[PDB]
């Protein structure tokens, strides 16, 4: 009976510590508490712009993480290496929290819980895996149905629809899960105006932000993924200039080193799922930014042990 409980229906730091320990021990958060986090976080997210704009004063830092894919024990490792989230220790998790990994429910409810506890200092951006098509195929819909009910998954889907699509730091660093656009002339204004509470279209700004990848050569190509595009160093350069930006931070691609600096330093990939699917053997990384110095400082980390549940 000693499960983690909300206090007056609200998330507290005490609750989060209890939750993370509960999840470490492979136990289930009660459906009614899961429900409350989901409805409350939907309210919080629905009030946000499609483009979150964050001001980082001279002394403040922020941590940017890439894909986590239900690798809950590696998530806790991030917090042990880099400290728990707080108003003095803000985080951005750049999409793809669920699917692939076997602890997606644990990752996402932990992330939502911290979103509720620190709404102004804990940021969640939508990934391509925070969608129906992907969830149906790649594990999350199954996991929710196994641990809770079909109805619970519908609520998760409707919550994902309210996740912002991009974040801009000090008007200079733009963060999105996928990347830049299939068409020329897209601006920050276009992004702000995206009605995001939906499943992504097959093409468009919303699709691109979740799906596109950088390529080494100039111009654009059809995506190997079958949706969106591959964009070259020249595409990046122009977009940044037209929008008065310094560089972009994206995720969406595994790197053996857990990060990649491409397009002449203008396109940065960060990936936070080490030894992805227990198979890839890749390192992962998180990024430190300061605002007195918006240049990314990379921190590589390796996978930690987890209980014997196979991917998917
Ligand atoms: C094309 C290969 C690039 O790496 C693929 C990675 C493995 C997972 O995370 C990314 C990729 C993505 O973000 O879409 C994969 C996935 O989420 O299915
Ligand atoms: Mn992705
Ligand atoms: Mn991914």
Curated annotation (Swiss-Prot):
<dbReference type="GO" id="GO:0006470">
    <property type="term" value="P:protein dephosphorylation"/>
</dbReference>
<keyword id="KW-0479">Metal-binding</keyword>
<keyword id="KW-0523">Neurodegeneration</keyword>
<keyword id="KW-0677">Repeat</keyword>
<keyword id="KW-0963">Cytoplasm</keyword>
<dbReference type="GO" id="GO:0016791">
    <property type="term" value="F:phosphatase activity"/>
</dbReference>
<keyword id="KW-0539">Nucleus</keyword>
<feature type="binding site">
    <location>
        <position position="96"/>
    </location>
    <ligand>
        <name>Mn(2+) 1</name>
    </ligand>
</feature>
<dbReference type="GO" id="GO:0032991">
    <property type="term" value="C:protein-containing complex"/>
</dbReference>
<dbReference type="GO" id="GO:0004722">
    <property type="term" value="F:protein serine/threonine phosphatase activity"/>
</dbReference>
<dbReference type="GO" id="GO:0004721">
    <property type="term" value="F:phosphoprotein phosphatase activity"/>
</dbReference>
<feature type="binding site">
    <location>
        <position position="100"/>
    </location>
    <ligand>
        <name>substrate</name>
    </ligand>
</feature>
<dbReference type="GO" id="GO:0046872">
    <property type="term" value="F:metal ion binding"/>
</dbReference>
<feature type="region of interest" description="Catalytic">
    <location>
        <begin position="9"/>
        <end position="312"/>
    </location>
</feature>
<feature type="binding site">
    <location>
        <begin position="128"/>
        <end position="129"/>
    </location>
    <ligand>
        <name>substrate</name>
    </ligand>
</feature>
<dbReference type="GO" id="GO:0005634">
    <property type="term" value="C:nucleus"/>
</dbReference>
<dbReference type="GO" id="GO:0031435">
    <property type="term" value="F:mitogen-activated protein kinase kinase kinase binding"/>
</dbReference>
<keyword id="KW-0802">TPR repeat</keyword>
<dbReference type="GO" id="GO:0003723">
    <property type="term" value="F:RNA binding"/>
</dbReference>
<dbReference type="GO" id="GO:0043123">
    <property type="term" value="P:positive regulation of canonical NF-kappaB signal transduction"/>
</dbReference>
<dbReference type="GO" id="GO:0006302">
    <property type="term" value="P:double-strand break repair"/>
</dbReference>
<dbReference type="GO" id="GO:0005829">
    <property type="term" value="C:cytosol"/>
</dbReference>
<comment type="function">
    <text>Serine/threonine-protein phosphatase that dephosphorylates a myriad of proteins involved in different signaling pathways including the kinases CSNK1E, ASK1/MAP3K5, PRKDC and RAF1, the nuclear receptors NR3C1, PPARG, ESR1 and ESR2, SMAD proteins and TAU/MAPT. Implicated in wide ranging cellular processes, including apoptosis, differentiation, DNA damage response, cell survival, regulation of ion channels or circadian rhythms, in response to steroid and thyroid hormones, calcium, fatty acids, TGF-beta as well as oxidative and genotoxic stresses.</text>
</comment>
<dbReference type="GO" id="GO:0051879">
    <property type="term" value="F:Hsp90 protein binding"/>
</dbReference>
<keyword id="KW-0446">Lipid-binding</keyword>
<dbReference type="GO" id="GO:0001965">
    <property type="term" value="F:G-protein alpha-subunit binding"/>
</dbReference>
<dbReference type="GO" id="GO:0043231">
    <property type="term" value="C:intracellular membrane-bounded organelle"/>
</dbReference>
<dbReference type="GO" id="GO:0043409">
    <property type="term" value="P:negative regulation of MAPK cascade"/>
</dbReference>
<keyword id="KW-0460">Magnesium</keyword>
<dbReference type="GO" id="GO:0008289">
    <property type="term" value="F:lipid binding"/>
</dbReference>
<keyword id="KW-0464">Manganese</keyword>
<feature type="binding site">
    <location>
        <position position="69"/>
    </location>
    <ligand>
        <name>Mn(2+) 1</name>
    </ligand>
</feature>
<dbReference type="GO" id="GO:0000278">
    <property type="term" value="P:mitotic cell cycle"/>
</dbReference>
<keyword id="KW-0034">Amyloid</keyword>
<dbReference type="GO" id="GO:1990635">
    <property type="term" value="C:proximal dendrite"/>
</dbReference>
<dbReference type="GO" id="GO:0101031">
    <property type="term" value="C:protein folding chaperone complex"/>
</dbReference>
<comment type="subunit">
    <text>Probably forms a complex composed of chaperones HSP90 and HSP70, co-chaperones STIP1/HOP, CDC37, PPP5C, PTGES3/p23, TSC1 and client protein TSC2. Probably forms a complex composed of chaperones HSP90 and HSP70, co-chaperones CDC37, PPP5C, TSC1 and client protein TSC2, CDK4, AKT, RAF1 and NR3C1; this complex does not contain co-chaperones STIP1/HOP and PTGES3/p23. Part of a complex with HSP90/HSP90AA1 and steroid receptors. Interacts (via TPR repeats) with HSP90AA1 (via TPR repeat-binding motif) or HSPA1A/HSPA1B; the interaction is direct and activates the phosphatase activity.</text>
</comment>
<dbReference type="GO" id="GO:0071276">
    <property type="term" value="P:cellular response to cadmium ion"/>
</dbReference>
<keyword id="KW-0007">Acetylation</keyword>
<dbReference type="GO" id="GO:0006351">
    <property type="term" value="P:DNA-templated transcription"/>
</dbReference>
<dbReference type="GO" id="GO:0030544">
    <property type="term" value="F:Hsp70 protein binding"/>
</dbReference>
<dbReference type="GO" id="GO:0070301">
    <property type="term" value="P:cellular response to hydrogen peroxide"/>
</dbReference>
